[PDB]
């Protein structure tokens, strides 16, 4: 369990911990799920928290989050993210692949925005974003 990995999981935790108080509540999980277009019932929220809430106090602290995330062992989050973008797995993110992710995550797009995004990331000028370019941009 290296210090580098623990830091990456801390950053992930902070995307859920809306008040920064070090715990994830059902309300905070529900807020994130709704911003992604999902609408879990308050009972599904409680059951997701419960499967992770080792001490039974009803909220998820960082050690409990770390246990959940550790169990699955996947690759580093940044490699995981690249695979989401590069759906055909050839090691390059195309304009069509970037449009797909933007659409799936509910981000409005224009062709000129997408071209400028690739252009900013595209160090070698081949018209696509490879892994090295992706990591440097992110």
């Amino acid at each position: 369990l290296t210090e580098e990995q623990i830091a990456e999981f801390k950053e992930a935790f902070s995307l859920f911990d809306k008040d920064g108080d070090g715990t994830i509540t059902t309300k905070e999980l529900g807020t994130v799920m709704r911003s992604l277009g999902q609408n879990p019932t308050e009972a599904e929220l409680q059951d997701m928290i419960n499967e992770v809430d080792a001490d039974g106090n009803g909220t998820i602290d960082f050690p409990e989050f770390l246990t959940m995330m550790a169990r699955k062992m996947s690759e580093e989050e940044i490699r995981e993210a690249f695979r989401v973008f590069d759906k055909d797995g050839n090691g390059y993110i195309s304009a069509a692949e970037l449009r797909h992710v933007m659409t799936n995550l509910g981000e409005k797009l224009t062709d000129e925005e997408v071209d400028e995004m690739i252009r900013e990331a595209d160090i070698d000028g081949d018209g696509q974003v490879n892994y090295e370019e992706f990591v440097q941009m992110m």
Binding site: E11, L36, Q38, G106
Partner: peptide, 24 residues
């Protein structure tokens, strides 16, 4: 400058992947 859009997507993708973990 479009780095903010890339970073917004990365943040949303990470939240989505953690939610998937909670669903499992």
């Amino acid at each position: 400058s479009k780095k903010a859009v890339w970073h917004k997507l990365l943040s949303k993708q990470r939240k989505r992947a953690v939610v998937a973990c909670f669903r499992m």
